[PDB]
Amino acid sequence: GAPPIMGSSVYITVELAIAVLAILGNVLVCWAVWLNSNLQNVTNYFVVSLAAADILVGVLAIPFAITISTGFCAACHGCLFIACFVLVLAQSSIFSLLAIAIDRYIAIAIPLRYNGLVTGTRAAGIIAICWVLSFAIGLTPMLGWNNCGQPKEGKAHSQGCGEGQVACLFEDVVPMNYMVYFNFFACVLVPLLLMLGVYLRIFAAARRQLADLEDNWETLNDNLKVIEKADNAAQVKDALTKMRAAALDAQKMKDFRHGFDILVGQIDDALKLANEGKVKEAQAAAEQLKTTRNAYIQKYLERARSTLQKEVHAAKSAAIIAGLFALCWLPLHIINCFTFFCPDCSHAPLWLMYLAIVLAHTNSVVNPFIYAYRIREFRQTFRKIIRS
Ligand SMILES: CC(C)CCC[C@@H](C)[C@H]1CC[C@H]2[C@H]3CC=C4C[C@@H](O)CC[C@]4(C)[C@@H]3CC[C@]12C
Ligand SMILES: CC(C)CCC[C@@H](C)[C@H]1CC[C@H]2[C@H]3CC=C4C[C@@H](O)CC[C@]4(C)[C@@H]3CC[C@]12C
Ligand SMILES: CC(C)CCC[C@@H](C)[C@H]1CC[C@H]2[C@H]3CC=C4C[C@@H](O)CC[C@]4(C)[C@@H]3CC[C@]12C
Ligand SMILES: CCCCCCCC/C=C\CCCCCCCC(=O)OC[C@H](O)CO
Ligand SMILES: Nc1nc(NCCc2ccc(O)cc2)nc2nc(-c3ccco3)nn12
Ligand SMILES: CCCCCCCC/C=C\CCCCCCCC(=O)O
């Protein structure tokens, strides 16, 4: 058996390295948003929220994990706080990730009402409640759901703890049914599945909105090819009725209104020419639609096409952040599941326990890199602060 202090030394060095990167990179996220006003949205108030959580992982959670791994003698309720504080920070990140997903869904499904419905004053309100809730979930073991009442007193005496003290070790004070049923299943896993669903609806609503754009546009010009080589007033009449409905449907800030104001006007009067039975001037009236089409309506579907793609790009960046949360945190939850559901199994070896803790702590480093690679406003603000 190698002295504990050398394996301890690798663990502690890596933990400290992670803390440094967690705080540095996430202090940059908070500085970017404070300085650049283009980055001050409700969306970014939640990203500043989870950057705060990531900062306090480095400043508090990682120092707590280093000390909890020594088994130091302590009063059991003080042990519980050292052991559970990181669950607060994890819960807070789950709420922040959930909020940005709902925000991005509101943005895409009802852009009309978005600015009305979502506002930075209520956002700050939601954020406070989410932190209060996060303390409640994460420190529930302190309200009595703990093993403090049945200490492992042989281990306390070996360490020579004083009276009332335990050897402070995570799996000794925190019950595993808390961790698996309450923490993992109810508070982590259910919210993640909800996120999954929100992101599915977002990409679905963006895909069918693009389809509706391209449908209205191919509806516009096939009708025109129909008027083109028609027979009589009655089918030009139909080919322009299908156009105008498609115009008003596609309509749902001043040069855009003109382009449709002309288009429907041009359709409208070709309609009355058709009704009065004049066929080929009703034709002739319907092909400088072709002109308004090239000068106006196709810049509309193009920049409309351009904006939905940005929103999908923004929603995929957010999805990556949530996926990496799940990746980095599930292994540890899965191990707890084995510990709890299979008492016939050998406990996961100590080196794997600490690999899993280290990997969950690593999640606090990755988000700043995801912003810098994926959102240009963040990337250029990072560059501007660094050079200066
Ligand atoms: C705002 C920030 C800077 C303050 C951080 C406060 C932390 C460091 C404080 C708050 C509560 C503290 C202790 C709570 C009670 C106990 C039990 C005792 O037997 C050992 C010390 C121990 C385990 C704690 C040590 C650290 C402690 C956790
Ligand atoms: C990418 C993420 C989500 C998947 C992670 C899968 C990891 C966490 C899985 C893969 C294999 C798993 C277990 C395989 C079997 C053993 C031996 C058993 O006595 C304790 C649990 C233990 C030690 C494993 C626990 C964790 C485990 C390592
Ligand atoms: C990954 C996301 C989508 C869902 C999480 C699935 C988890 C809850 C699933 C995946 C693998 C599962 C089990 C794998 C095999 C074993 C050994 C058995 O003796 C007790 C159940 C136990 C320990 C697992 C229980 C939980 C289990 C870990
Ligand atoms: C805002 C920035 C401020 C930064 C804040 C720094 C965070 C504190 C660091 C580590 C806390 C862990 C300290 C707990 C260690 C206690 C050890 C102990 O209690 O020794 C007792 C002995 O074993 C017999 O009682
Ligand atoms: N099971 C567990 N253990 C620890 N530390 C104890 C690692 C260990 C496990 C057994 C042992 O004999 C000595 C040390 N931290 C832990 N953190 C979590 C956790 C936090 C959030 C989700 O799971 N689980 N967890
Ligand atoms: C930005 C400020 C961050 C503050 C970090 C403080 C650094 C503390 C580093 C590790 C603390 C480990 C304490 C060891 C536990 C006591 C040992 C024992 O009781 O046996």
Which atom of ligand 2 lies at the shortest distance from residue 330's CA? 3
> Cα–Cα distance between 235 and 275 in angstroms, integer?
10
Ligand nearest to the CA of 23: 6
Q: How far is CA 22 from CA 187, 233, 332, in A?
A: 24, 72, 20
Ligand 2 centroid – CA 334 distance (Å): 7
> 3-state SS string over 333-388?
HHHHHHHHHCCCCCCCCHHHHHHHHHHHHHHHHHHHHHHHHHCHHHHHHHHHHHHC
Which atom of ligand 3 lies at the shortest distance from residue 344's CA? 19
Residues 6+ apart with CB under 8 A from 211: none
**Neighbour count for residue 107 (Cβ, 10 Å):** 19
Q: 3-state class of 167 per DSSP?
A: strand
- State whether the beta carbon of 307 lies less than 6 angstroms from ligand 4: no
Q: 3-state class of 166 per DSSP?
A: strand
Contact present, 93 and 188 (Cβ < 8 Å):
no
Closest C-alpha residue for ligand 1 atom 11: 78
The binding-site residues of ligand 1, defined as CB within 6 angstroms of any ligand atom, are 74-75, 78, 81-82
Question: At 280, which helix (H) or strand (E)?
Answer: helix 279-286
E strand spans, 161-320 = 165-167
Which atom of ligand 6 lies at the shortest distance from residue 71's CA? 20
Closest C-alpha residue for ligand 1 atom 8: 60
> Cα–Cα distance between 308 and 314 in angstroms, integer?
10
Pocket test for ligand 1, best of 81, 85, 89 (most atoms within 8 A of CB): 81
Ligand 5 centroid – CA 170 distance (Å): 6
Ligand 1 centroid – CA 198 distance (Å): 39
- State whether the beta carbon of 345 lies less than 6 angstroms from ligand 2: yes
DSSP state of 181: I
> Cα–Cα distance between 340 and 193 in angstroms, integer?
22
CATH number of 210-303: 1.20.120.10
Ligand 3 centroid – CA 191 distance (Å): 18
Which atom of ligand 1 lies at the shortest distance from residue 59's CA? 3
Backbone conformation region of residue 105, classed left if phi is above 0, alpha if psi is from -120 to 50, else beta: alpha
DSSP state of 140: G
Q: How far is CA 372 from CA 25, 78, 322, 379, in A?
A: 10, 39, 16, 4
Closest C-alpha residue for ligand 1 atom 23: 78
Ligand 2 centroid – CA 157 distance (Å): 33
> Cα–Cα distance between 101 and 112 in angstroms, integer?
18
- State whether the beta carbon of 73 lies less than 6 angstroms from ligand 4: yes
DSSP state of 141: G
> Cα–Cα distance between 379 and 158 in angstroms, integer?
54
Pocket test for ligand 2, best of 171, 188, 332, 335 (most atoms within 8 A of CB): 335
What does this entry list as its resolution, in Å? Answer: 2.7
DSSP string, 24-89: HHHHHHHHHHHH-GGG-SHHHHHHHHHHHHHHHIIIIIHHHHHHHTTT-EEEHHHHHHHHHHHHHH
Report which of 80, 34, 86 is spatially closest to residue 56, judged by C-alpha positions: 86
> Cα–Cα distance between 360 and 349 in angstroms, integer?
17
Q: Is 264 exposed, middle or buried (0-12, 13-18, 19+ CB in 10 A)?
A: middle
Report which of 241, 203, 240 is spatially closest to residue 224, judged by C-alpha positions: 240
Ligand 1 centroid – CA 168 distance (Å): 13
Ligand 1 centroid – CA 217 distance (Å): 65
Q: What are phi and psi of 36, to 5 degrees?
A: -85, 115
Closest C-alpha residue for ligand 6 atom 16: 67
Q: Is 58 exposed, middle or buried (0-12, 13-18, 19+ CB in 10 A)?
A: buried
Which atom of ligand 2 lies at the shortest distance from residue 352's CA? 23
Residues 6+ apart with CB under 8 A from 388: none
Closest C-alpha residue for ligand 6 atom 15: 67
The binding-site residues of ligand 5, defined as CB within 6 angstroms of any ligand atom, are 86-87, 90, 169-171, 179, 332-333, 336, 350, 353, 357
In the numeric block, the tokens 């301890």 are attached to 8
Ligand nearest to the CA of 20: 6
Closest C-alpha residue for ligand 3 atom 22: 338
